[PDB]
Amino acid sequence: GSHSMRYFFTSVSRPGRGEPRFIAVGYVDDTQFVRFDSDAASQRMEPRAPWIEQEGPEYWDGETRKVKAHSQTHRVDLGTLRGYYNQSEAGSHTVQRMYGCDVGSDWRFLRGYHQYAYDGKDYIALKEDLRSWTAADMAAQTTKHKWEAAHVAEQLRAYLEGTCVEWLRRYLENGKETLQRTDAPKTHMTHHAVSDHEATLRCWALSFYPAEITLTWQRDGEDQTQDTELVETRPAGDGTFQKWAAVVVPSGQEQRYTCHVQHEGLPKPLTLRWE
Amino acid sequence: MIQRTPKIQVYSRHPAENGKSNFLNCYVSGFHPSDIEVDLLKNGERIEKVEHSDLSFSKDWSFYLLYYTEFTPTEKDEYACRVNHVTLSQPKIVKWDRDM
Amino acid sequence: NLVPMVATV
């Protein structure tokens, strides 16, 4: 199926407490493979996946270099953004950036992106055509104009349609055992006793990859979306994910309820019943 | 300025069975800003060999982290997650229900 | 593989 390579950058200013915090993580699909933490000992881009580990010195020196560059721009940006908004020196503010590339089942470029936020909110973004921008507000306009004048979008398009997708492909091979795998959910049902006339019926999805999943509870074949407790997809910490959905059943009515699991690691959708 | 409240989940990496080694996870997500205090507790008592994942964020810019500690469940021991954030008027404590 | 150049806002 389709695949992605995404880099996530978080810049946090620390008025008084040294330089700003800079974090950079990289993902291929739902699997992180590298990290940089302005606080960490190394000051290098580091591995976080077993496959990227034997990449080479040239690769690690190059990536270390660029993430240190990304870092600088972001320290600078922090100052520039305080000015655009006439914000005070003592304020602690956030900047986030995400960029990456997708390829289809054919491994050919599909789409690219570059998202930038200030204070957990849209600041400026590359449009889907990779030539123009969408500046959220009046302050972001100045950046829009700046990058437009500097053909920033062309060299960005160059990377996302070339180096990005061609490297995603490289990684998909370097860790084809990790990245070309799907762990189908390990499912089951539990049944507790809330009171004497009610009971909790919980459907479980465990140890699955990738993250995308659908759990739905049904009464008499009729979806209970409005009466289901659905928790967000969390990480098992071992590279797989978990999830669960619960309904409250008027005792005896257990027969009427079924959990439905959809995951790409399944041949058929699963229909679970308490029986 | 934008502030979002952390959601908190306390769960084990594998199904929990007394006497067998596992990881205690505390997944905090959907928060903003990224500053957050997260503790794991053994019978109302801070655990020290705790690690966390690298700061990442979702489609809405809100952040998420995973805090985890190697541990081994027992019949009687209690486990919980203590979380403080700007959006909380006091540290929130979420107990681990193991069944579940 | 990171983007080689990162322009300022």
PDB file of N, CA, C and O in Angstrom, chain A residues 20-63:
ATOM      1  N   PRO A  20      16.620  27.968  23.106  1.00  0.00           N
ATOM      2  CA  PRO A  20      15.343  27.259  22.950  1.00  0.00           C
ATOM      3  C   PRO A  20      15.521  25.747  22.785  1.00  0.00           C
ATOM      4  O   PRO A  20      16.505  25.288  22.193  1.00  0.00           O
ATOM      5  N   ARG A  21      14.565  24.989  23.316  1.00  0.00           N
ATOM      6  CA  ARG A  21      14.521  23.541  23.142  1.00  0.00           C
ATOM      7  C   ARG A  21      14.193  23.212  21.690  1.00  0.00           C
ATOM      8  O   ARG A  21      13.296  23.808  21.101  1.00  0.00           O
ATOM      9  N   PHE A  22      14.938  22.283  21.106  1.00  0.00           N
ATOM     10  CA  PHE A  22      14.656  21.853  19.743  1.00  0.00           C
ATOM     11  C   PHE A  22      14.608  20.338  19.656  1.00  0.00           C
ATOM     12  O   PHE A  22      15.582  19.645  19.972  1.00  0.00           O
ATOM     13  N   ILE A  23      13.459  19.831  19.230  1.00  0.00           N
ATOM     14  CA  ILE A  23      13.286  18.406  19.033  1.00  0.00           C
ATOM     15  C   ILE A  23      12.958  18.100  17.579  1.00  0.00           C
ATOM     16  O   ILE A  23      12.181  18.816  16.933  1.00  0.00           O
ATOM     17  N   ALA A  24      13.568  17.041  17.065  1.00  0.00           N
ATOM     18  CA  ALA A  24      13.288  16.597  15.714  1.00  0.00           C
ATOM     19  C   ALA A  24      13.156  15.080  15.716  1.00  0.00           C
ATOM     20  O   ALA A  24      14.090  14.375  16.078  1.00  0.00           O
ATOM     21  N   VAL A  25      11.986  14.589  15.323  1.00  0.00           N
ATOM     22  CA  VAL A  25      11.787  13.164  15.129  1.00  0.00           C
ATOM     23  C   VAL A  25      11.389  12.870  13.683  1.00  0.00           C
ATOM     24  O   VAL A  25      10.810  13.707  13.002  1.00  0.00           O
ATOM     25  N   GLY A  26      11.742  11.683  13.208  1.00  0.00           N
ATOM     26  CA  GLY A  26      11.423  11.289  11.857  1.00  0.00           C
ATOM     27  C   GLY A  26      10.695   9.965  11.894  1.00  0.00           C
ATOM     28  O   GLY A  26      11.038   9.087  12.677  1.00  0.00           O
ATOM     29  N   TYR A  27       9.674   9.842  11.055  1.00  0.00           N
ATOM     30  CA  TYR A  27       8.900   8.617  10.935  1.00  0.00           C
ATOM     31  C   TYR A  27       8.901   8.132   9.483  1.00  0.00           C
ATOM     32  O   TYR A  27       8.869   8.926   8.543  1.00  0.00           O
ATOM     33  N   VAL A  28       8.945   6.824   9.304  1.00  0.00           N
ATOM     34  CA  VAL A  28       8.495   6.222   8.062  1.00  0.00           C
ATOM     35  C   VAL A  28       7.226   5.485   8.477  1.00  0.00           C
ATOM     36  O   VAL A  28       7.257   4.627   9.370  1.00  0.00           O
ATOM     37  N   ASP A  29       6.100   5.874   7.883  1.00  0.00           N
ATOM     38  CA  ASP A  29       4.797   5.379   8.307  1.00  0.00           C
ATOM     39  C   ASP A  29       4.577   5.625   9.808  1.00  0.00           C
ATOM     40  O   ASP A  29       4.774   6.750  10.282  1.00  0.00           O
ATOM     41  N   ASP A  30       4.177   4.588  10.547  1.00  0.00           N
ATOM     42  CA  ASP A  30       3.924   4.723  11.981  1.00  0.00           C
ATOM     43  C   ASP A  30       5.143   4.327  12.826  1.00  0.00           C
ATOM     44  O   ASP A  30       5.031   4.137  14.031  1.00  0.00           O
ATOM     45  N   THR A  31       6.303   4.206  12.185  1.00  0.00           N
ATOM     46  CA  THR A  31       7.534   3.761  12.846  1.00  0.00           C
ATOM     47  C   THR A  31       8.547   4.900  12.889  1.00  0.00           C
ATOM     48  O   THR A  31       9.035   5.332  11.837  1.00  0.00           O
ATOM     49  N   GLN A  32       8.855   5.392  14.088  1.00  0.00           N
ATOM     50  CA  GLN A  32       9.935   6.364  14.226  1.00  0.00           C
ATOM     51  C   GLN A  32      11.285   5.711  13.903  1.00  0.00           C
ATOM     52  O   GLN A  32      11.497   4.540  14.233  1.00  0.00           O
ATOM     53  N   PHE A  33      12.191   6.448  13.256  1.00  0.00           N
ATOM     54  CA  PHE A  33      13.507   5.881  12.923  1.00  0.00           C
ATOM     55  C   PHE A  33      14.709   6.723  13.378  1.00  0.00           C
ATOM     56  O   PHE A  33      15.821   6.204  13.495  1.00  0.00           O
ATOM     57  N   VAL A  34      14.481   8.010  13.644  1.00  0.00           N
ATOM     58  CA  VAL A  34      15.551   8.895  14.120  1.00  0.00           C
ATOM     59  C   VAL A  34      15.060   9.950  15.126  1.00  0.00           C
ATOM     60  O   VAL A  34      13.854  10.183  15.268  1.00  0.00           O
ATOM     61  N   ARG A  35      16.003  10.565  15.838  1.00  0.00           N
ATOM     62  CA  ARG A  35      15.692  11.635  16.792  1.00  0.00           C
ATOM     63  C   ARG A  35      16.850  12.634  16.924  1.00  0.00           C
ATOM     64  O   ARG A  35      18.027  12.310  16.679  1.00  0.00           O
ATOM     65  N   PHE A  36      16.501  13.862  17.284  1.00  0.00           N
ATOM     66  CA  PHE A  36      17.472  14.846  17.736  1.00  0.00           C
ATOM     67  C   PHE A  36      16.830  15.631  18.865  1.00  0.00           C
ATOM     68  O   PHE A  36      15.696  16.076  18.761  1.00  0.00           O
ATOM     69  N   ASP A  37      17.562  15.794  19.950  1.00  0.00           N
ATOM     70  CA  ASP A  37      17.072  16.498  21.117  1.00  0.00           C
ATOM     71  C   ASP A  37      18.165  17.476  21.525  1.00  0.00           C
ATOM     72  O   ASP A  37      19.278  17.067  21.886  1.00  0.00           O
ATOM     73  N   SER A  38      17.856  18.766  21.443  1.00  0.00           N
ATOM     74  CA  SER A  38      18.810  19.824  21.763  1.00  0.00           C
ATOM     75  C   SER A  38      19.470  19.634  23.125  1.00  0.00           C
ATOM     76  O   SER A  38      20.523  20.200  23.391  1.00  0.00           O
ATOM     77  N   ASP A  39      18.840  18.833  23.978  1.00  0.00           N
ATOM     78  CA  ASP A  39      19.320  18.594  25.330  1.00  0.00           C
ATOM     79  C   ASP A  39      20.169  17.332  25.426  1.00  0.00           C
ATOM     80  O   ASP A  39      21.107  17.282  26.209  1.00  0.00           O
ATOM     81  N   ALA A  40      19.848  16.322  24.619  1.00  0.00           N
ATOM     82  CA  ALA A  40      20.581  15.053  24.632  1.00  0.00           C
ATOM     83  C   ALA A  40      22.105  15.244  24.559  1.00  0.00           C
ATOM     84  O   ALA A  40      22.609  16.281  24.085  1.00  0.00           O
ATOM     85  N   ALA A  41      22.827  14.231  25.036  1.00  0.00           N
ATOM     86  CA  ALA A  41      24.285  14.288  25.141  1.00  0.00           C
ATOM     87  C   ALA A  41      24.990  14.454  23.799  1.00  0.00           C
ATOM     88  O   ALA A  41      25.818  15.364  23.625  1.00  0.00           O
ATOM     89  N   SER A  42      24.642  13.580  22.855  1.00  0.00           N
ATOM     90  CA  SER A  42      25.343  13.472  21.568  1.00  0.00           C
ATOM     91  C   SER A  42      25.451  14.757  20.727  1.00  0.00           C
ATOM     92  O   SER A  42      26.532  15.085  20.217  1.00  0.00           O
ATOM     93  N   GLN A  43      24.334  15.471  20.598  1.00  0.00           N
ATOM     94  CA  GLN A  43      24.227  16.598  19.678  1.00  0.00           C
ATOM     95  C   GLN A  43      24.312  16.081  18.241  1.00  0.00           C
ATOM     96  O   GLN A  43      24.664  16.816  17.317  1.00  0.00           O
ATOM     97  N   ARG A  44      23.987  14.800  18.070  1.00  0.00           N
ATOM     98  CA  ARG A  44      23.936  14.164  16.764  1.00  0.00           C
ATOM     99  C   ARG A  44      22.501  13.749  16.487  1.00  0.00           C
ATOM    100  O   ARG A  44      21.702  13.557  17.412  1.00  0.00           O
ATOM    101  N   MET A  45      22.174  13.600  15.210  1.00  0.00           N
ATOM    102  CA  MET A  45      20.999  12.841  14.838  1.00  0.00           C
ATOM    103  C   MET A  45      21.281  11.403  15.257  1.00  0.00           C
ATOM    104  O   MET A  45      22.380  10.891  15.029  1.00  0.00           O
ATOM    105  N   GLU A  46      20.304  10.762  15.885  1.00  0.00           N
ATOM    106  CA  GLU A  46      20.505   9.426  16.404  1.00  0.00           C
ATOM    107  C   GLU A  46      19.492   8.465  15.824  1.00  0.00           C
ATOM    108  O   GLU A  46      18.441   8.892  15.355  1.00  0.00           O
ATOM    109  N   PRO A  47      19.819   7.161  15.838  1.00  0.00           N
ATOM    110  CA  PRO A  47      18.904   6.098  15.403  1.00  0.00           C
ATOM    111  C   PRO A  47      17.805   5.853  16.434  1.00  0.00           C
ATOM    112  O   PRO A  47      18.013   6.134  17.615  1.00  0.00           O
ATOM    113  N   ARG A  48      16.653   5.352  15.990  1.00  0.00           N
ATOM    114  CA  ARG A  48      15.596   4.901  16.903  1.00  0.00           C
ATOM    115  C   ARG A  48      14.920   3.649  16.346  1.00  0.00           C
ATOM    116  O   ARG A  48      14.034   3.061  16.973  1.00  0.00           O
ATOM    117  N   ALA A  49      15.365   3.242  15.162  1.00  0.00           N
ATOM    118  CA  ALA A  49      14.935   1.996  14.560  1.00  0.00           C
ATOM    119  C   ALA A  49      16.166   1.144  14.241  1.00  0.00           C
ATOM    120  O   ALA A  49      17.207   1.660  13.812  1.00  0.00           O
ATOM    121  N   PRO A  50      16.053  -0.172  14.469  1.00  0.00           N
ATOM    122  CA  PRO A  50      17.141  -1.128  14.234  1.00  0.00           C
ATOM    123  C   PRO A  50      17.649  -1.136  12.786  1.00  0.00           C
ATOM    124  O   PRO A  50      18.818  -1.467  12.569  1.00  0.00           O
ATOM    125  N   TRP A  51      16.807  -0.778  11.819  1.00  0.00           N
ATOM    126  CA  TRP A  51      17.214  -0.872  10.418  1.00  0.00           C
ATOM    127  C   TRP A  51      18.099   0.292   9.924  1.00  0.00           C
ATOM    128  O   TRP A  51      19.054   0.076   9.167  1.00  0.00           O
ATOM    129  N   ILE A  52      17.785   1.513  10.358  1.00  0.00           N
ATOM    130  CA  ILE A  52      18.553   2.706   9.971  1.00  0.00           C
ATOM    131  C   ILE A  52      19.935   2.704  10.641  1.00  0.00           C
ATOM    132  O   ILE A  52      20.796   3.537  10.332  1.00  0.00           O
ATOM    133  N   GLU A  53      20.143   1.746  11.542  1.00  0.00           N
ATOM    134  CA  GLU A  53      21.311   1.737  12.423  1.00  0.00           C
ATOM    135  C   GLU A  53      22.639   1.522  11.694  1.00  0.00           C
ATOM    136  O   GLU A  53      23.644   2.148  12.030  1.00  0.00           O
ATOM    137  N   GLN A  54      22.649   0.638  10.703  1.00  0.00           N
ATOM    138  CA  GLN A  54      23.861   0.429   9.923  1.00  0.00           C
ATOM    139  C   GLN A  54      23.814   1.197   8.617  1.00  0.00           C
ATOM    140  O   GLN A  54      24.085   0.653   7.545  1.00  0.00           O
ATOM    141  N   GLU A  55      23.464   2.477   8.707  1.00  0.00           N
ATOM    142  CA  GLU A  55      23.377   3.332   7.530  1.00  0.00           C
ATOM    143  C   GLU A  55      24.763   3.736   7.038  1.00  0.00           C
ATOM    144  O   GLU A  55      25.094   3.552   5.867  1.00  0.00           O
ATOM    145  N   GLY A  56      25.568   4.290   7.940  1.00  0.00           N
ATOM    146  CA  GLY A  56      26.911   4.719   7.601  1.00  0.00           C
ATOM    147  C   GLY A  56      27.263   6.060   8.215  1.00  0.00           C
ATOM    148  O   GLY A  56      26.387   6.791   8.676  1.00  0.00           O
ATOM    149  N   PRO A  57      28.553   6.382   8.221  1.00  0.00           N
ATOM    150  CA  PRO A  57      29.027   7.650   8.786  1.00  0.00           C
ATOM    151  C   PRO A  57      28.608   8.842   7.934  1.00  0.00           C
ATOM    152  O   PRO A  57      28.164   9.857   8.471  1.00  0.00           O
ATOM    153  N   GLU A  58      28.748   8.714   6.619  1.00  0.00           N
ATOM    154  CA  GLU A  58      28.382   9.787   5.701  1.00  0.00           C
ATOM    155  C   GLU A  58      26.931  10.213   5.900  1.00  0.00           C
ATOM    156  O   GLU A  58      26.607  11.397   5.831  1.00  0.00           O
ATOM    157  N   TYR A  59      26.062   9.237   6.146  1.00  0.00           N
ATOM    158  CA  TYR A  59      24.645   9.508   6.353  1.00  0.00           C
ATOM    159  C   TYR A  59      24.405  10.205   7.688  1.00  0.00           C
ATOM    160  O   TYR A  59      23.653  11.178   7.766  1.00  0.00           O
ATOM    161  N   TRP A  60      25.049   9.703   8.737  1.00  0.00           N
ATOM    162  CA  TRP A  60      24.906  10.273  10.065  1.00  0.00           C
ATOM    163  C   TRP A  60      25.521  11.651  10.227  1.00  0.00           C
ATOM    164  O   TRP A  60      25.024  12.451  11.023  1.00  0.00           O
ATOM    165  N   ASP A  61      26.598  11.919   9.486  1.00  0.00           N
ATOM    166  CA  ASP A  61      27.244  13.230   9.512  1.00  0.00           C
ATOM    167  C   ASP A  61      26.395  14.251   8.778  1.00  0.00           C
ATOM    168  O   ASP A  61      26.249  15.398   9.230  1.00  0.00           O
ATOM    169  N   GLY A  62      25.838  13.827   7.643  1.00  0.00           N
ATOM    170  CA  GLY A  62      24.956  14.669   6.847  1.00  0.00           C
ATOM    171  C   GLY A  62      23.693  15.058   7.595  1.00  0.00           C
ATOM    172  O   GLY A  62      23.324  16.241   7.644  1.00  0.00           O
ATOM    173  N   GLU A  63      23.031  14.063   8.188  1.00  0.00           N
ATOM    174  CA  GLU A  63      21.776  14.301   8.910  1.00  0.00           C
ATOM    175  C   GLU A  63      21.966  15.142  10.180  1.00  0.00           C
ATOM    176  O   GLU A  63      21.209  16.082  10.433  1.00  0.00           O
TER     177      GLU A  63
END
